[PDB]
Amino acid sequence: KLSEMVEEELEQMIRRREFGEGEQLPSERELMAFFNVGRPSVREALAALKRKGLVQINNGERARVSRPSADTIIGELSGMAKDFLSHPGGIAHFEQLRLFFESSLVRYAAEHATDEQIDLLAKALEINSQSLDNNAAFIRSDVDFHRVLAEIPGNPIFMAIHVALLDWLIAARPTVTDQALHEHNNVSYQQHIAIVDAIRRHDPDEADRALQSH
Amino acid sequence: KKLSEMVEEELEQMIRRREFGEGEQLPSERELMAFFNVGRPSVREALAALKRKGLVQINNGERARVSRPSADTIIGELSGMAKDFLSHPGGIAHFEQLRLFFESSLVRYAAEHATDEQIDLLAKALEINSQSLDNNAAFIRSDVDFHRVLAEIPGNPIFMAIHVALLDWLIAARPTVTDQALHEHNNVSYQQHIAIVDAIRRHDPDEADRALQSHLN
Numbered sequence: 001k002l003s004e005m006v007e008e009e010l011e012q013m014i015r016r017r018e019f020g021e022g023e024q025l026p027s028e029r030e031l032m033a034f035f036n037v038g039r040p041s042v043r044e045a046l047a048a049l050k051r052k053g054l055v056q057i058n059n060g061e062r063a064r065v066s067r068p069s070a071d072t073i074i075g076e077l078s079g080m081a082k083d084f085l086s087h088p089g090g091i092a093h094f095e096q097l098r099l100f101f102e103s104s105l106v107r108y109a110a111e112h113a114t115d116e117q118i119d120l121l122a123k124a125l126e127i128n129s130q131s132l133d134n135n136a137a138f139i140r141s142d143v144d145f146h147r148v149l150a151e152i153p154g155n156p157i158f159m160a161i162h163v164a165l166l167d168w169l170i171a172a173r174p175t176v177t178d179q180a181l182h183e184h185n186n187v188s189y190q191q192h193i194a195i196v197d198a199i200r201r202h203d204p205d206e207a208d209r210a211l212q213s214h
Numbered sequence: 215k216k217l218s219e220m221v222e223e224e225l226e227q228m229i230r231r232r233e234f235g236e237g238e239q240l241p242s243e244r245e246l247m248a249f250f251n252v253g254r255p256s257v258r259e260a261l262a263a264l265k266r267k268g269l270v271q272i273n274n275g276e277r278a279r280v281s282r283p284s285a286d287t288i289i290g291e292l293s294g295m296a297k298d299f300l301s302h303p304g305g306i307a308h309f310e311q312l313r314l315f316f317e318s319s320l321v322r323y324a325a326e327h328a329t330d331e332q333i334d335l336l337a338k339a340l341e342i343n344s345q346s347l348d349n350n351a352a353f354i355r356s357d358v359d360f361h362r363v364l365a366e367i368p369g370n371p372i373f374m375a376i377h378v379a380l381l382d383w384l385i386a387a388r389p390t391v392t393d394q395a396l397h398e399h400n401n402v403s404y405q406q407h408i409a410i411v412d413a414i415r416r417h418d419p420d421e422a423d424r425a426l427q428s429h430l431n
C-alpha cells in the first residue's frame with residue numbers, strides 16, 4: 001500500500017508542477033528518504049507511473065516526467081462532462097456553465113457593441129411579414145441571433161465555443177421534435193428581443209437580467 | 215475565404231436552422247452546384263468538412279444524410295480548432311480572453327452569493343500568495359489555487375474542473391520573468407487578488423468585475 005501512496009503523491013506532485021518536464025525526479029535513494037519508505041515501494045511506484053505514461057525510465061537512470069498530453073486532459077474532462085448529462089443535476093450544472101458564457105457575451109455587447117453591431121442583432125430578430133411558416137422563422141432568428149452575439153467581441157474562437165456548448169447538450173438527448181422546438185423557439189424569441197432592447201440601451205445589468213429571467 | 219468554405223458555412227447554417235431536417239438526404243452534388251453556382255470540387259470539399267463536423271453522414275459512398283454531432287465529434291472539432299489557432303503567433307491570446315469572459319461571470323456570481331465562509335477561504339488563499347512572492351513555481355501554484363477557490367464558489371463541479379484546467383494551462387504557459395523582476399511581478403498579481411476579494415466582501419459585482427478586468431487585461 002505504501003507503494004500506492006508514493007505513486008499517488010508523485011502523480012500529484014507532477015500535476016502541481018513540483019517537478020518540471022525533465023529527469024527532474026529524484027533518484028531512488030532520495031525518494032526513500034523523502035517518503036521514509038523502502039526501495040521496493042519506490043521501485044513499484046515508479047513502475048506504475050511509467051505504465052500510466054507519466055514518466056520515462058531507461059536503464060536504471062532517473063525518471064523523467066512526461067505530463068499528460070492535451071488529449072488525455074481533454075479526454076478526462078470531456079468524459080466527465082458527458083457522463084454528468086445522464087443525471088438531472090448534471091444537466092443543471094452544464095446549463096449554468098453555458099449561462100456563465102452567455103452572461104459575459106450579453107454584458108460585453110451592451111457596453112461595447114457599436115450601432116452597426118446592434119443593428120445586426122436586431123436584423124437577426126426581423127421576421128418577414130410575408131413569412132409563410134412562423135415557426136421556421138423563429139428557428140432561423142434563434143440561430144442568427146446567437147451567431148451575431150458570439151461574434152461581437154471579435155474573438156474567432158467564441159462562435160465555435162458557443163455552438164459546441166449547445167451541441168454538447170443536444171448530443172446527450174434524443175433528437176428534438178419539431179413540436180417541442182416550436183414552443184421553445186417562441187420563448188427564446190421573447191428573451192432575445194428583451195436582450196437586444198437592453199443592448200440598445202447600453203445597459204449590461206438589464207441585458208443580463210433578461211437573459212436570466214427564469 | 216474559399217468558395218468551398220462559403221458553401222460549407224451556408225450549408226451548416228441551413229442544417230442548423232432545420233432548413234434541412236435531421237435524417238433526410240441533402241440534395242445531390244449536381245443540385246448543390248446549381249444551388250450555389252460552384253464547381254463539383256467545391257461541393258465535395260464542403261461536404262467533406264460537414265462530415266468531419268458530424269453534420270452529415272456519408273457511408274460506403276452513399277449520398278450525404280443530415281446528422282448531428284456526437285460528443286466525440288464535438289471534442290475532435292474543438293481540439294482541431296484550438297490546435298489550428300494556437301499555431302498562429304499570439305493565438306493563445308484568444309484563450310486568455312476566453313478565460314477572462316468566464317471568470318468575469320464567476321466573480322460577479324461570487325460577489326452576489328459568496329458566504330462568509332467562502333470569503334475566508336479566499337482570504338486564506340491570499341495568505342499563500344503573500345508567502346510565495348520569491349519563488350516562481352510556488353507563486354504559480356498559489357495563483358492557480360486562488361482562482362480555484364473562486365471557481366468552487368458556485369458549487370458547480372463541471373465548471374470548476376474545466377475552468378481551473380484552462381487557467382492552469384494558460385498561467386503555466388507564459389514564459390517566466392527574470393529573477394530581478396520576479397518579486398514585484400508576483401506582488402502585482404497578489405495586490406490585484408486582494409482587490410478582487412475586497413470587492414466580493416463588499417458584495418459589489420461591478421467592483422469585482424472591474425478588479426478582475428485589471429487583473430487579466
Ligand SMILES: CC(=O)N[C@H]1[C@H]([C@H](O)[C@H](O)CO)O[C@](O)(C(=O)O)C[C@@H]1O
Pocket residue numbers: 353354357361385388399400402403429430
Ligand atoms: C503581473 C502579471 O501580469 N500577473 C499575472 C499573473 C502572472 O502572469 C502569473 O502569475 C505568472 O507569472 O497571472 C494572473 O494572476 C492570472 O492569470 O491569474 C494574472 C496576472 O495579471
Ligand SMILES: [Zn+2]
Pocket residue numbers: 357360361403407429
Ligand atoms: Zn491571478
